[PDB]
Amino acid sequence: DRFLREKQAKLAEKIREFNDARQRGTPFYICRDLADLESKSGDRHGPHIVEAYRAVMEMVGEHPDAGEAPRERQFAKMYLDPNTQSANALAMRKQILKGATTFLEKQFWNEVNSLIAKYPQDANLGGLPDVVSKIKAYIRLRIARKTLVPDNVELQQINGEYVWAIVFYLLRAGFVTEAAQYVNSNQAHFRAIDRTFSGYINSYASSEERRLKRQMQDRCMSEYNQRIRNAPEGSIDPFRMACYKIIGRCDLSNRSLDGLQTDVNDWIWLQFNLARETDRSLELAGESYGLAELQASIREIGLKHFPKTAAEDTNGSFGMFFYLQILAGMFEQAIAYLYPFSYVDAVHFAIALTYYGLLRPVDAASAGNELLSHNTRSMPQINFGRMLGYYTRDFRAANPAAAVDYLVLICLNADEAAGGQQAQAALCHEALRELVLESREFSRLIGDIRPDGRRIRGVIEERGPLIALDDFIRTITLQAASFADDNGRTTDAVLLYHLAEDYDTVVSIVSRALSEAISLEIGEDPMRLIPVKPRVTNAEGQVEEAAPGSSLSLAAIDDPVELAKAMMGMYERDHMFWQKIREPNRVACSVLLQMADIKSLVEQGRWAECLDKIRALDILPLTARGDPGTIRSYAARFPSLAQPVAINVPNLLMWTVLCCMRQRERLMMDELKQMTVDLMAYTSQLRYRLPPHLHEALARASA
């Protein structure tokens, strides 16, 4: 769980680099990279998954040392073609076999070189050692180790060289041409021991299909039956049999290397080497062995030799079977088989494959299936969408950016090839929508605000190109905004409603939060708001390109007054926002700000100023001395006043009255005491629109 948490971290960042590369057009090698990470994490099943990755590399054409890599989903159209009897299908099947056969030849060839490099003086090669020369050296070293053959078997020799061993191990290493031309370099010597073989191997090396001419195939098969199949034991060089099995595909019913010293990799190689696909409607029973039969073989080996659950596993052998299923292009089954043993590896390997288009996804209509299901055509499907979303719920709460990287990968299957082109893109949207509503990181996901009101694009809309992205971001903002205004999260609501360009609503929200703060008595603790989540988490020991004050998010605003000033500040400086705010609304907030200031003066202890700013409001009749008539003029204005303003008139009085009575304390005095009681007339005339018993508290503070 701890070493795992680290593994998930390094992988998550690679998936970050991955998406940056896809968007910018930078060369990227997903399989090569994912393999490197897996080889450095030291799992027991590691090496098998590393091998599988590299097998897919050879299959797909991911060659970093040549700056060559296939385009995004280059095989989707080919692999996802439902018509199993199409040109696309036949080509896809061929490439799997070719890739696996090629990979398994390279695998062996590397061993040959390693063994030679381990014994240089013994190898004794010339100035420009050719492959044939290296193979002979490899045979020599095997001989010295007594690991070339099983005892009691004598091999045909020529000048001290086991000619058949040399031919076989050249075919084993994929050097078919060099095998044929080695025989041709020794025509006479081969003519003496086998007059027909040269003809067969030359025909074998001259074609793309690695097949013999029909006429030759008949002759080779007959000969193999009459002179080799049922011959006295030890009457035939074990390697010669092997060469015939390979060259002539003799005895496909027994795909094994009995007389030879072989391991599991030699067996696997033989299976792919002998496999052939055909465009012909029919094949002879004795020549019928392609990928379908090969896959069927691997399938049965799984049930018989390997575990399905993690409780049945012990030493990490499940990796071998996953590896086999990959070679065979049983991709959906391979991933489904691995998930229980290592869901992390399963998830990322599925990403690697889906990127190239080698993983059949469920359609959107059946997006509620278990990991592995089958479609109408009985073909295996992986629920890529759900698998990802499910995977991100191990860290989306404490790392929403990483979660966005994965959810975006859902749109890999959202192209013309997948079939459900736009339905898969819709799934990705909902996955991201449920992420935004579930988290409070709006400054990160949707965007932040600069002092002048300009938006700082969020992570999601920057990944727009990678998810078919207009109104989606605008939509999820409005709902996330309404959800915040209704649930009393004032700061989030202001952030979101501004991003949605609903500036008028923003003013109403700050007016309300500011109105509530003004109402509280002078003495209570100041009203505090929960600040929006910061857009960046600058850290100890780390650098902060994002300095405080550069955005609303990094302003740490938790005071309704400071909030109102900030938003009203930018809205009034730029006429663009201003004209989009209703006059009564903007004017109301302005009045509230004055009120908050008037309140600050009282709580501070400045009487002279209080009176002035209150007089400046021109809401109360405070220039009248005893005038009965003018009072009415203002009483009729009350209903016109905005709610959030009117609701604090009761508070104003208590301030205006208290301050005036204090002013009496420090003609002028008589006049001040006059208005003081004049307010007490203001209330009365409109007493059934203020609190019930304000007088008694008012007159009290009035001595």
Binding site: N254, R255, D258, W267, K304
Partner: peptide, 18 residues
């Protein structure tokens, strides 16, 4: 049958080598 019987021999032997 021979190929199937042979595969069993190679993988059984391989498993025991773990």
């Amino acid at each position: 049958d021979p190929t199937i019987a042979a595969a069993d021999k190679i993988f059984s032997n391989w498993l025991a080598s773990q």
